[model samples]
Target: GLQAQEKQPTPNLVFIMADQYRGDAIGCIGKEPVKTPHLDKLASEGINFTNAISSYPVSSPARGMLMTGMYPIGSKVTGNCNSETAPYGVELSQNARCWSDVLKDQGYNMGYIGKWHLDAPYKPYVDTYNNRGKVAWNEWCPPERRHGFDHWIAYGTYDYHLKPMYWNTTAPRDSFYYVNQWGPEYEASKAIEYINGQKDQKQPFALVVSMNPPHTGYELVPDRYKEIYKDLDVEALCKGRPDIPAKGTEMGDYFRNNIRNYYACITGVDENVGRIIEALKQNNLFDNTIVVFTSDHGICMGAHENAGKDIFYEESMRIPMILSWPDQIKPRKSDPLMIAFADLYPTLLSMMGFSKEIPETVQTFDLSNEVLTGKNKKDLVQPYYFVKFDNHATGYRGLRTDRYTYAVHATDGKIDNVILFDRTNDPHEMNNIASQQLKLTHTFNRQLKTWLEKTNDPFAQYIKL
Candidate 1:
């Protein structure tokens, strides 16, 4: 009876995360032909963070940074969460203090749905298609390790977008079930159910909908969405992108075969995004709730002649970041505060009025005041890393500043390659000015060194600085 008398100053949270959804994919961005009408509308009603990028453009590591506001080493997800990396322990930190943990302790009903590529897959591989390969990517997140989320329905890393699988909150590991429908579509329905059910409850709710599409196997989308892009020549569409590979090359063939379906997947996911938005408005919870639409990381469709992520290119690192709180935030665009995944944990918690709840171990800046007051920060540097289990220093450490991107790649624990791009003049990031601008490159290298030391990156010792 006393619980009803308590006035909750905190607001509900609806975080929508999509896989491989780049910063420019939204219709409002006008950089891509892909249609995201619902997301465009959401951006119109909220703040569109134009300068947001993932610290590490990989699944497990980026998601780890997003959850704990910690770097790859700090969060214990050095590489993709898979059987190959299992021995190296590439998975989300078991006892990490996530933003959800604080919210749950503050009396919020936490809900999580869709893809959760944060757990390590194990033996008897659950009879899934992803397990057929040598490196298994599908696993179940145990309830206790869900970081305080009570209503959980998610998978580790399944790519079958058409026919997805899920495990319930109370179900055992082997009890996982498959839904014949598409992933985002089914997750949206479940999210609406969870939202509507919270109407009568006095406490606020936090729900996360993670859609794993526009990632790969782009052909898995429904015929309806695919049909819309059937006749459009993706090759011609990407003709202006000089960074795309030549048509006869292997990478070009990949871009040709997959670009259309990738757009379809985005549109398909966009439809489901609208459904969730409408549900919140229908239940009269839109005004009081804080809605965030973002993605784990992005893929360079053909930029830098590559079609995947874990690269230093703008197409691979930049991600759309839209945050909306109707009662508190005014609609805006291109808010130029440079932000990374680690910053999300502290910023979101601080913005939620739980400033003191931000864990002591978080290793990034909090831009809550900038998001709330429309202020901007300039010349800030955000660190990026690409880790591989093959060797301790097989990948690279990078930095993204306001107008440039720099990377220091090491293989076998020695520097092998370096790339620097002046994004202000070269939007496509075609020029490698690391060799040309020696002084600037060294300056950026020193900046990256400071970030590396700041995050306490485990692999920092291996770099030949």
Candidate 2:
């Protein structure tokens, strides 16, 4: 008789990340006017981390944190880099370790699709996207810069969906094209194709489908998705604020015109997410595969009169996070414990049954037990989530707790503004009580300073309350 084939003991990991997806954008969240049916289903059948946060709200820094489970201070990626000449846009150190590197060491075949910004080329003195030369933006990332993901179909970062550029390992020199399909759907197709192919493989796989949608340039979304929200008045959902300019004028009109398309982009991404899940189920990988859905950071579509992200506000820092694994993970479970993007690395490793200790560079706490069992371990989780943005001497540091949102802003490396909000009383963050509540703000400021010192932040010495 033929020898019996041994079953693969390792589980599969599928991490889906959408660009600029808001925490409250899901249909089940019931806070936003958007429709995310597939994402809602993921939440219903898995663990919905209602309070997930992005320590850095920009694309590159947030992704760096996610990959290394380390703050931007340690990761050395504090801002987006357009090319090799942009100031503050640093390349991820080859010596630096990431989750993919760890998993590859543990016998998992890792693949990455879509945006990969951690390998950005340094561009000194130039900060804005328009300022830097675009030559390196479209170039192929060297194998060494890829960390340890063996398969790659990605770009540094680009927003054009219809004419998206990707470089794969099979053909590293030339860029690949999928002209007919939208960006998200194209990425989904690749993910589905990858998953289907993985069924016959001997080793478990860790695949990431990072889609750049539900981001800005919402006009690039397909007409079908746009039709879904065509007639709905979305500007009313903008939550106009007096602090920022053009609230009831040009910005308001722009919000009215573009918000529907933004929602449509999210729905388009949702459809693609559904496609990936179905592909997994068809290949009999759904049960053993761990599906993690989240975003790099949240977008501010006119929330608090803000049109973009890279801020400390909830509309910018909060993101949707869901983890689904049949049999191993509970369905319809909700965990209110606050989770930062950096925590994902250790937490995911713990969940995957990795026996090795977490790397020393990672400083965040692991909340795997809380994520899987809905039980909050006081000591194993952070009481407040930290956020920072540093680029061209324009930066800020902040913290988010269950009840409050506090921020300290600096210009030219000097403190300029401090903001404090009681989320329990003003979820919209309409008031800034930092000046009024000196005692409370001072306490939070001290806490932030202590954290900065512990992390060895470069700005800690310059920071003054």
Candidate 3:
């Protein structure tokens, strides 16, 4: 007997991603003190996930997960710091087939509006991101300029707000101009224009307006917003206590002042998001497109006494995720399930009807159908695994289950830290249950160790540096 082929709707997907935002910062997560009305409104119309986690909690590796649909080790993007270079022995290795490639292969006209960070560090050309293994795009230029999309624009890595002004990849590099208003609006508007122009075309479009906000160099924000955001009330969220940094010797008002400025930056980004959403509605792309709003990872608004990312704690790993498609997905909440950013590839591919034939093992999962049908699969996504190829001598592997965290150093078999918090009991994850809860810790640690062995995580290996 043949299994019933699921009737999946192929709606255009507009994946909007924030660079590094946490689950608690968004209104739907009920973590925000100030209003995230734009994000909140989208959550009202879609599914808001509670237990979302980043496979690796940083910009490059985390975003790499989205493109390749594989974990850091699987994709070979397993480092915390990077320069634009390439290594050999790596075939397409999942870097080749970005969401654009898969969607384009499936007959969608894909156009990227901002932040195409998936390309090889050595290849700056836009077309360098072809779907084939380790080769350049059909329009491949050495400093890979741009191709494959009907339209293209973007920013380089580690962009601060103001100084090294990020322009459209399609624009002349020498033509860099200082932004007067917020940074993302220009890119967002460009996207809207393209969508409006293409709505009547023979094909539906997949547009990605990737924005880098709330990820700082606070000095770059425009003068006006900075003045207000620095003083805006964070009392509701922070409760008057500032988030502190976990590592490093540098400290003091640096982070305290930065958090306020960060909110201003986020608020500014929200305004651009508001404009983008309106553009979608006015162009009739709203209902027809699967609008996704999420961040790569969360920033520490002083959670766990740490201010920066790359930490294994929930404040840094838990991210904000929302997906909405009118007439397709029901507007509601989904239970806490452990979903990784890497799963977006399969989720998007599955939604578009092309997972099994892709011939790759980049752990993809389909949650759109379940969420849309109004069945909460929180149990399925929960007690999920979060992997990190950190900068430790031995590094560490973390297992986040329903209520406990089991972590071990990759260098030695020593137990680095075990955090056990009954989510139902300690929502803040403040109490350490590892001392009293011995059995549960052992079980999860074994589970994590088995997972590490199966995933080929970096253990018994030394950092070359």
Q: What are the per-residue Cα lDDT tens digits for candidate 1 across 413-444?
A: 77888899898888788889889999998787
**What C-alpha lDDT do the candidate models reach, one value each?**
0.85, 0.76, 0.61
Q: Write the per-residue lDDT of candidate 3 for residues 147-183, one digit (tens) a residue.
A: 3454666544435455334444445644434455455
> Which structure is stronger by lDDT: 1 or 3?
1
Top candidate when judged by lDDT against the true structure: 1
Q: What value of lDDT does candidate 2 attain over all alpha carbons?
A: 0.76
TM-scores, all candidates, are 0.95, 0.90, 0.80
Candidate 1 regions exceeding 4 Å error are 1-7, 458-465
Best by TM-score: 1
> Which residues of candidate 3, in runs, are more than 4 Å off?
1-9, 84-95, 119-150, 163-181, 223-231, 234-237, 240-255, 333-335, 356-358, 381-393, 412-424, 458-465
Give every collision pair in model 1.
Answer: none
What TM-score number comes out for model 1? 0.95
Model 2, which residues run further than 4 Å from truth?
1-7, 84-89, 121-139, 173-178, 235-247, 355-357, 377-394, 411-414, 463-465
TM-score for candidate 3, residues paired by index: 0.80
Number of clashes found in candidate 3:
15
Better of 2 and 3 by TM-score: 2
